[PDB]
Amino acid sequence: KITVHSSKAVKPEYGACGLAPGCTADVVPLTVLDKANFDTYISVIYAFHAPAPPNAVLEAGLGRALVDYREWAGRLGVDASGGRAILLNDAGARFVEATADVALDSVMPLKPTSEVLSLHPSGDDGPEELMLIQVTRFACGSLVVGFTTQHIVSDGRSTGNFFVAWSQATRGAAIDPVPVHDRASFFHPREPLHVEYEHRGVEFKPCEKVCGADGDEDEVVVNKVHFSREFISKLKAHASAGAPRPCSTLQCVVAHLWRSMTMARGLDGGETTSVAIAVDGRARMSPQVPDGYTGNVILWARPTTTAGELVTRPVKHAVELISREVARINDGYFKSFIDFANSGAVEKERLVATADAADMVLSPNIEVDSWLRIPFYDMDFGGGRPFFFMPSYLPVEGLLILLPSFLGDGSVDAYVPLFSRDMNTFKNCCY
Protein backbone atom coordinates (compact mmCIF):
# COMPACT_ATOMS: atom_id res chain seq x y z
CA LYS A 1 0.00 0.00 0.00
CA ILE A 2 3.09 2.34 0.34
CA THR A 3 4.67 3.72 -2.91
CA VAL A 4 8.05 5.58 -2.85
CA HIS A 5 7.96 8.38 -5.54
CA SER A 6 11.28 10.18 -4.73
CA SER A 7 14.57 9.44 -2.89
CA LYS A 8 17.30 12.15 -2.96
CA ALA A 9 20.08 13.85 -0.98
CA VAL A 10 19.20 17.01 1.02
CA LYS A 11 22.27 19.23 1.77
CA PRO A 12 22.67 22.18 4.18
CA GLU A 13 21.09 25.28 2.50
CA TYR A 14 23.58 27.99 3.63
CA GLY A 15 22.24 30.31 0.86
CA ALA A 16 18.72 30.37 2.49
CA CYS A 17 20.42 32.71 4.95
CA GLY A 18 23.32 34.15 2.88
CA LEU A 19 25.65 32.23 5.31
CA ALA A 20 29.18 31.21 4.18
CA PRO A 21 29.16 27.66 2.75
CA GLY A 22 30.50 25.11 5.28
CA CYS A 23 34.05 23.85 4.66
CA THR A 24 33.36 20.32 3.29
CA ALA A 25 36.90 19.23 4.48
CA ASP A 26 35.69 19.70 8.15
CA VAL A 27 36.16 16.53 10.28
CA VAL A 28 34.78 15.85 13.82
CA PRO A 29 36.47 12.99 15.74
CA LEU A 30 34.00 10.63 17.52
CA THR A 31 34.45 10.79 21.35
CA VAL A 32 35.16 7.76 23.62
CA LEU A 33 31.44 8.04 24.65
CA ASP A 34 30.30 7.90 20.95
CA LYS A 35 32.54 4.80 20.44
CA ALA A 36 31.05 3.19 23.64
CA ASN A 37 27.53 3.29 22.07
CA PHE A 38 25.81 1.07 19.44
CA ASP A 39 27.22 1.15 15.85
CA THR A 40 23.71 0.71 14.34
CA TYR A 41 20.66 2.56 12.90
CA ILE A 42 17.62 3.25 15.15
CA SER A 43 14.17 3.88 13.56
CA VAL A 44 11.14 5.77 15.00
CA ILE A 45 7.75 6.82 13.49
CA TYR A 46 5.70 10.01 14.13
CA ALA A 47 2.10 10.56 12.84
CA PHE A 48 0.40 13.96 12.18
CA HIS A 49 -3.31 14.69 11.40
CA ALA A 50 -4.28 16.48 8.13
CA PRO A 51 -3.63 19.16 7.12
CA ALA A 52 0.22 18.87 7.24
CA PRO A 53 2.88 20.97 5.42
CA PRO A 54 3.70 19.78 1.86
CA ASN A 55 6.97 17.85 1.10
CA ALA A 56 8.62 21.01 -0.44
CA VAL A 57 8.07 22.96 2.87
CA LEU A 58 9.37 19.96 4.91
CA GLU A 59 12.38 19.59 2.50
CA ALA A 60 13.28 23.34 2.71
CA GLY A 61 13.03 23.10 6.56
CA LEU A 62 15.40 20.07 6.52
CA GLY A 63 17.92 21.99 4.32
CA ARG A 64 17.84 24.92 6.81
CA ALA A 65 18.12 22.64 9.94
CA LEU A 66 21.13 20.75 8.41
CA VAL A 67 23.15 24.07 8.45
CA ASP A 68 23.19 23.69 12.30
CA TYR A 69 23.30 19.79 12.19
CA ARG A 70 25.95 19.17 9.47
CA GLU A 71 26.74 15.82 11.26
CA TRP A 72 23.50 14.44 9.71
CA ALA A 73 24.60 15.52 6.14
CA GLY A 74 28.08 13.95 6.70
CA ARG A 75 29.67 10.47 6.32
CA LEU A 76 31.63 8.21 8.73
CA GLY A 77 35.39 7.95 8.04
CA VAL A 78 38.71 8.63 9.86
CA ASP A 79 40.52 11.83 11.06
CA ALA A 80 44.26 12.73 10.59
CA SER A 81 45.22 10.48 13.61
CA GLY A 82 43.20 7.51 12.15
CA GLY A 83 40.43 7.76 14.81
CA ARG A 84 36.79 7.22 13.71
CA ALA A 85 35.30 10.59 12.68
CA ILE A 86 32.30 12.33 11.08
CA LEU A 87 33.36 13.82 7.71
CA LEU A 88 31.25 17.04 7.40
CA ASN A 89 31.44 16.63 3.56
CA ASP A 90 27.73 17.75 3.22
CA ALA A 91 27.06 14.66 0.96
CA GLY A 92 23.48 14.95 2.40
CA ALA A 93 20.76 13.21 4.46
CA ARG A 94 18.42 10.87 2.51
CA PHE A 95 14.91 12.35 1.97
CA VAL A 96 12.31 9.75 0.80
CA GLU A 97 8.78 10.82 -0.35
CA ALA A 98 6.02 8.12 -0.24
CA THR A 99 2.20 7.88 -0.52
CA ALA A 100 -0.15 5.28 1.06
CA ASP A 101 -3.43 4.43 -0.79
CA VAL A 102 -5.35 4.08 2.54
CA ALA A 103 -6.60 6.50 5.26
CA LEU A 104 -4.14 6.49 8.24
CA ASP A 105 -7.16 5.96 10.63
CA SER A 106 -7.90 2.57 8.88
CA VAL A 107 -4.50 1.09 10.05
CA MET A 108 -4.38 2.94 13.46
CA PRO A 109 -3.16 2.23 15.96
CA LEU A 110 0.00 0.93 14.15
CA LYS A 111 1.35 -2.29 15.77
CA PRO A 112 5.07 -3.12 16.22
CA THR A 113 5.35 -5.69 13.34
CA SER A 114 7.60 -5.92 10.20
CA GLU A 115 4.81 -3.90 8.40
CA VAL A 116 5.99 -0.57 10.03
CA LEU A 117 9.51 -1.03 8.43
CA SER A 118 7.84 0.33 5.20
CA LEU A 119 7.31 3.77 6.94
CA HIS A 120 11.08 4.61 7.27
CA PRO A 121 14.21 4.11 5.12
CA SER A 122 16.12 0.85 5.81
CA GLY A 123 18.92 0.85 8.43
CA ASP A 124 19.77 -2.77 7.40
CA ASP A 125 21.04 -2.46 3.73
CA GLY A 126 24.29 -0.53 4.54
CA PRO A 127 23.23 3.08 3.72
CA GLU A 128 26.08 5.70 3.50
CA GLU A 129 23.78 8.44 4.92
CA LEU A 130 23.79 8.88 8.75
CA MET A 131 20.29 10.51 8.73
CA LEU A 132 17.48 8.97 6.60
CA ILE A 133 13.98 10.53 6.58
CA GLN A 134 10.73 9.30 4.97
CA VAL A 135 7.56 11.45 4.62
CA THR A 136 4.52 9.21 3.86
CA ARG A 137 1.28 11.01 2.80
CA PHE A 138 -1.86 8.89 3.56
CA ALA A 139 -5.07 9.00 1.45
CA CYS A 140 -6.82 11.62 3.63
CA GLY A 141 -3.80 13.93 4.08
CA SER A 142 -2.31 12.51 7.34
CA LEU A 143 1.54 12.58 7.43
CA VAL A 144 3.88 9.87 8.83
CA VAL A 145 7.53 10.98 9.40
CA GLY A 146 9.94 8.00 9.71
CA PHE A 147 13.53 8.54 10.98
CA THR A 148 16.46 6.07 10.57
CA THR A 149 19.52 7.45 12.46
CA GLN A 150 23.10 6.29 13.28
CA HIS A 151 23.44 5.76 17.09
CA ILE A 152 27.27 6.37 16.81
CA VAL A 153 26.54 10.09 15.92
CA SER A 154 23.93 10.96 18.62
CA ASP A 155 22.21 9.41 21.67
CA GLY A 156 18.39 9.56 22.10
CA ARG A 157 18.60 13.12 23.54
CA SER A 158 20.79 14.72 20.77
CA THR A 159 18.83 12.73 18.08
CA GLY A 160 15.59 14.19 19.59
CA ASN A 161 17.16 17.72 19.50
CA PHE A 162 17.63 17.27 15.70
CA PHE A 163 13.97 16.09 15.22
CA VAL A 164 12.85 19.27 17.06
CA ALA A 165 15.41 21.48 15.17
CA TRP A 166 13.98 20.29 11.80
CA SER A 167 10.43 21.26 13.01
CA GLN A 168 11.69 24.68 14.35
CA ALA A 169 13.56 25.47 11.05
CA THR A 170 10.44 24.43 9.02
CA ARG A 171 8.25 26.95 11.01
CA GLY A 172 11.01 29.64 10.88
CA ALA A 173 11.55 29.44 14.70
CA ALA A 174 15.16 29.75 16.02
CA ILE A 175 16.80 26.32 16.64
CA ASP A 176 16.68 25.70 20.43
CA PRO A 177 18.86 24.41 21.93
CA VAL A 178 21.83 26.05 20.08
CA PRO A 179 23.85 23.02 18.85
CA VAL A 180 27.40 22.42 20.20
CA HIS A 181 29.62 20.57 17.67
CA ASP A 182 33.28 20.71 18.92
CA ARG A 183 33.47 17.10 20.28
CA ALA A 184 37.34 17.29 20.44
CA SER A 185 36.89 19.96 23.25
CA PHE A 186 35.01 17.42 25.49
CA PHE A 187 36.08 14.42 27.64
CA HIS A 188 39.87 15.13 27.71
CA PRO A 189 41.58 12.49 29.92
CA ARG A 190 42.89 13.67 33.36
CA GLU A 191 46.67 14.20 33.94
CA PRO A 192 47.63 11.91 35.45
CA LEU A 193 45.18 9.17 34.21
CA HIS A 194 43.03 7.88 37.15
CA VAL A 195 40.98 4.64 36.67
CA GLU A 196 38.77 4.05 39.79
CA TYR A 197 36.46 1.23 38.47
CA GLU A 198 36.94 -2.02 36.50
CA HIS A 199 35.61 -1.32 32.93
CA ARG A 200 36.62 -4.79 31.57
CA GLY A 201 33.43 -6.93 31.46
CA VAL A 202 31.35 -3.69 31.78
CA GLU A 203 31.90 -1.23 28.82
CA PHE A 204 34.71 -3.36 27.21
CA LYS A 205 35.19 -7.04 26.21
CA PRO A 206 37.99 -8.90 24.35
CA CYS A 207 37.73 -8.80 20.56
CA GLU A 208 35.87 -11.96 19.44
CA LYS A 209 35.83 -12.79 15.65
CA VAL A 210 24.12 -18.82 8.33
CA CYS A 211 20.49 -18.57 7.17
CA GLY A 212 18.07 -21.37 8.13
CA ALA A 213 19.85 -22.82 11.22
CA ASP A 214 17.14 -21.06 13.39
CA GLY A 215 14.21 -23.38 12.39
CA ASP A 216 13.32 -24.74 15.91
CA GLU A 217 13.58 -21.19 17.45
CA ASP A 218 10.47 -19.65 19.14
CA GLU A 219 9.29 -16.44 17.34
CA VAL A 220 9.93 -13.14 19.23
CA VAL A 221 6.67 -11.07 19.40
CA VAL A 222 6.79 -7.33 20.31
CA ASN A 223 4.05 -6.81 22.98
CA LYS A 224 2.81 -3.31 23.97
CA VAL A 225 2.59 -3.29 27.83
CA HIS A 226 0.45 -0.34 29.10
CA PHE A 227 1.21 1.12 32.59
CA SER A 228 -1.86 3.24 33.59
CA ARG A 229 -1.42 6.43 35.73
CA GLU A 230 -3.22 4.42 38.49
CA PHE A 231 -0.88 1.36 38.19
CA ILE A 232 2.29 3.59 38.23
CA SER A 233 0.88 5.38 41.38
CA LYS A 234 0.44 1.99 43.22
CA LEU A 235 3.87 0.72 41.97
CA LYS A 236 5.64 3.97 43.08
CA ALA A 237 3.72 4.01 46.45
CA HIS A 238 4.92 0.37 47.04
CA ALA A 239 8.57 1.16 46.05
CA SER A 240 8.78 4.54 47.93
CA ALA A 241 7.33 3.29 51.29
CA GLY A 242 9.44 4.62 54.24
CA ALA A 243 11.79 6.68 51.95
CA PRO A 244 12.43 10.45 52.37
CA ARG A 245 11.75 10.92 48.59
CA PRO A 246 9.66 8.83 46.13
CA CYS A 247 11.27 6.56 43.52
CA SER A 248 11.12 7.72 39.86
CA THR A 249 8.53 6.33 37.36
CA LEU A 250 11.52 5.19 35.17
CA GLN A 251 13.23 3.16 37.96
CA CYS A 252 9.87 1.66 39.19
CA VAL A 253 8.77 0.60 35.62
CA VAL A 254 12.30 -0.79 34.86
CA ALA A 255 12.24 -2.84 38.16
CA HIS A 256 8.70 -4.17 37.34
CA LEU A 257 9.59 -5.15 33.71
CA TRP A 258 12.89 -6.79 34.87
CA ARG A 259 11.04 -8.94 37.47
CA SER A 260 8.10 -9.69 35.05
CA MET A 261 10.54 -10.68 32.19
CA THR A 262 12.54 -12.94 34.61
CA MET A 263 9.34 -14.78 35.75
CA ALA A 264 8.09 -14.99 32.08
CA ARG A 265 11.41 -16.62 30.97
CA GLY A 266 11.08 -19.25 33.80
CA LEU A 267 14.83 -19.12 34.65
CA ASP A 268 16.58 -21.39 37.18
CA GLY A 269 16.44 -19.48 40.55
CA GLY A 270 20.30 -19.58 40.64
CA GLU A 271 20.69 -17.89 37.18
CA THR A 272 22.48 -14.46 37.17
CA THR A 273 20.27 -11.65 35.67
CA SER A 274 21.23 -7.99 34.96
CA VAL A 275 19.29 -5.02 33.50
CA ALA A 276 21.26 -2.39 31.48
CA ILE A 277 19.85 1.16 32.16
CA ALA A 278 21.15 4.14 30.10
CA VAL A 279 22.43 7.03 32.33
CA ASP A 280 22.59 10.57 30.82
CA GLY A 281 26.01 12.04 31.82
CA ARG A 282 25.23 15.65 30.68
CA ALA A 283 24.12 16.95 34.16
CA ARG A 284 26.19 14.31 36.11
CA MET A 285 29.64 15.37 34.75
CA SER A 286 31.55 18.43 36.06
CA PRO A 287 31.66 20.65 34.15
CA GLN A 288 28.18 19.82 32.71
CA VAL A 289 27.77 19.00 28.98
CA PRO A 290 25.49 21.56 27.25
CA ASP A 291 21.88 20.64 26.24
CA GLY A 292 22.82 21.37 22.56
CA TYR A 293 25.81 18.95 22.50
CA THR A 294 25.21 16.81 19.34
CA GLY A 295 27.06 13.64 20.53
CA ASN A 296 26.44 10.60 22.79
CA VAL A 297 26.74 11.18 26.60
CA ILE A 298 25.55 7.72 27.84
CA LEU A 299 26.99 5.03 30.11
CA TRP A 300 24.98 2.13 31.66
CA ALA A 301 24.01 1.09 35.21
CA ARG A 302 24.06 -2.77 35.27
CA PRO A 303 22.30 -3.82 38.53
CA THR A 304 22.70 -7.64 38.95
CA THR A 305 21.05 -10.30 41.21
CA THR A 306 19.82 -13.94 40.87
CA ALA A 307 16.46 -14.77 39.17
CA GLY A 308 15.30 -16.44 42.45
CA GLU A 309 16.02 -13.36 44.64
CA LEU A 310 14.44 -10.99 42.03
CA VAL A 311 11.10 -12.89 41.60
CA THR A 312 10.64 -13.93 45.34
CA ARG A 313 11.40 -10.44 46.86
CA PRO A 314 8.90 -7.55 46.38
CA VAL A 315 9.48 -5.16 43.38
CA LYS A 316 10.53 -2.57 46.08
CA HIS A 317 13.80 -4.56 46.57
CA ALA A 318 14.43 -4.49 42.75
CA VAL A 319 13.85 -0.66 42.66
CA GLU A 320 16.29 -0.25 45.63
CA LEU A 321 18.99 -2.25 43.71
CA ILE A 322 18.38 -0.14 40.51
CA SER A 323 18.36 3.18 42.52
CA ARG A 324 21.70 2.34 44.29
CA GLU A 325 23.40 1.17 41.02
CA VAL A 326 22.20 4.22 38.95
CA ALA A 327 23.49 6.59 41.73
CA ARG A 328 27.02 5.02 41.34
CA ILE A 329 27.15 6.16 37.64
CA ASN A 330 28.32 9.68 38.66
CA ASP A 331 30.98 12.24 37.54
CA GLY A 332 33.81 10.03 38.92
CA TYR A 333 32.44 6.97 37.03
CA PHE A 334 32.28 8.88 33.67
CA LYS A 335 35.83 10.29 34.28
CA SER A 336 37.15 6.75 35.19
CA PHE A 337 35.69 5.41 31.89
CA ILE A 338 37.20 8.34 29.87
CA ASP A 339 40.65 7.80 31.51
CA PHE A 340 40.47 3.99 30.91
CA ALA A 341 39.45 4.51 27.21
CA ASN A 342 42.49 6.90 26.80
CA SER A 343 44.94 4.61 28.75
CA GLY A 344 46.11 2.37 25.81
CA ALA A 345 44.70 -0.77 27.56
CA VAL A 346 41.89 -0.96 24.91
CA GLU A 347 44.46 -1.08 22.02
CA LYS A 348 47.05 -3.31 23.87
CA GLU A 349 44.41 -5.87 25.11
CA ARG A 350 42.37 -5.69 21.81
CA LEU A 351 39.17 -4.67 23.71
CA VAL A 352 35.90 -3.66 21.92
CA ALA A 353 32.61 -2.06 23.14
CA THR A 354 30.11 -4.37 24.97
CA ALA A 355 27.38 -2.22 23.24
CA ASP A 356 27.15 -4.83 20.41
CA ALA A 357 24.13 -4.31 18.04
CA ALA A 358 25.02 -7.53 16.09
CA ASP A 359 23.41 -9.91 18.69
CA MET A 360 19.74 -10.68 19.61
CA VAL A 361 20.79 -13.09 22.47
CA LEU A 362 20.06 -11.02 25.68
CA SER A 363 18.45 -13.65 28.04
CA PRO A 364 19.00 -13.96 30.96
CA ASN A 365 19.70 -10.16 30.92
CA ILE A 366 17.45 -7.30 29.73
CA GLU A 367 18.19 -3.85 28.28
CA VAL A 368 15.79 -0.90 28.81
CA ASP A 369 15.96 1.95 26.24
CA SER A 370 13.95 4.85 27.82
CA TRP A 371 12.33 7.17 25.20
CA LEU A 372 10.30 8.84 28.06
CA ARG A 373 11.83 12.27 27.05
CA ILE A 374 11.30 11.72 23.26
CA PRO A 375 10.18 15.03 21.66
CA PHE A 376 6.37 15.18 21.23
CA TYR A 377 4.78 18.56 22.18
CA ASP A 378 7.91 20.41 20.82
CA MET A 379 7.62 18.50 17.44
CA ASP A 380 5.63 21.04 15.32
CA PHE A 381 6.24 21.64 11.54
CA GLY A 382 3.47 24.33 11.57
CA GLY A 383 0.50 21.87 11.39
CA GLY A 384 0.49 21.11 15.16
CA ARG A 385 2.13 18.41 17.35
CA PRO A 386 2.00 14.69 16.41
CA PHE A 387 -0.95 12.56 17.72
CA PHE A 388 1.06 9.26 17.67
CA PHE A 389 4.68 7.98 17.83
CA MET A 390 6.24 4.49 18.17
CA PRO A 391 9.58 2.69 17.85
CA SER A 392 10.12 0.63 14.66
CA TYR A 393 10.02 -3.21 14.72
CA LEU A 394 13.09 -4.57 16.63
CA PRO A 395 12.23 -8.17 17.69
CA VAL A 396 15.29 -8.57 20.03
CA GLU A 397 14.11 -10.68 23.02
CA GLY A 398 14.59 -8.67 26.28
CA LEU A 399 15.33 -5.29 24.57
CA LEU A 400 12.54 -3.11 26.11
CA ILE A 401 11.67 0.42 24.82
CA LEU A 402 9.67 2.77 27.16
CA LEU A 403 7.47 5.52 25.59
CA PRO A 404 5.31 8.21 27.26
CA SER A 405 1.51 8.07 26.52
CA PHE A 406 0.92 9.64 23.02
CA LEU A 407 -2.34 10.86 24.75
CA GLY A 408 -0.33 12.95 27.31
CA ASP A 409 -2.44 11.22 30.05
CA GLY A 410 0.67 10.31 32.18
CA SER A 411 0.58 6.50 31.56
CA VAL A 412 3.66 4.68 30.05
CA ASP A 413 3.83 2.15 27.13
CA ALA A 414 6.66 -0.45 27.09
CA TYR A 415 7.40 -2.33 23.81
CA VAL A 416 8.46 -5.76 25.21
CA PRO A 417 9.81 -8.40 22.75
CA LEU A 418 8.94 -11.85 24.27
CA PHE A 419 9.34 -15.45 23.03
CA SER A 420 5.70 -16.38 22.10
CA ARG A 421 5.80 -19.27 24.67
CA ASP A 422 6.65 -16.74 27.51
CA MET A 423 3.79 -14.23 26.76
CA ASN A 424 1.02 -15.86 28.90
CA THR A 425 3.32 -16.07 32.04
CA PHE A 426 4.40 -12.41 31.48
CA LYS A 427 0.68 -11.38 31.23
CA ASN A 428 -0.20 -13.22 34.54
CA CYS A 429 2.85 -11.89 36.48
CA CYS A 430 2.27 -8.34 35.20
CA TYR A 431 -0.22 -7.06 37.87
Q: What integer value in Å does the Rg equal?
A: 22 Å
**End-to-end separation:** 39 Å
How does the helix and strand content classify structurally?
alpha+beta
- Count of domain modules: 2
Count of DSSP-assigned helices: 9
Could you tell me the number of beta strands?
Answer: 18
- What oligomeric assembly is this protein in? monomer
DSSP strand content: 15-25%
Organism: Hordeum vulgare
Enzyme class: transferase
EC number: 2.3.1.64
GO molecular function: agmatine N4-coumaroyltransferase activity
How would you describe the overall organization of this protein?
- One of its GO terms (molecular function) is agmatine N4-coumaroyltransferase activity.
- It comes from Hordeum vulgare.
- The protein is of the alpha+beta class.
- The protein has two domains: 2-185, Chloramphenicol Acetyltransferase; 218-373 and 393-430, Chloramphenicol acetyltransferase-like domain (Chloramphenicol Acetyltransferase).
- 23% of the residues lie in helices and 24% in strands.
- It is built from nine helices and 18 strands.
- Strands 10, 11, 12, 13, 15, 17 and 18 form a seven-stranded mixed β-sheet that branches. It has a six-stranded mixed β-sheet with strand order 1-6-7-8-3-16. The protein has a three-stranded antiparallel β-sheet with strand order 2-5-4, with no helix packed on it.
- It is globular.
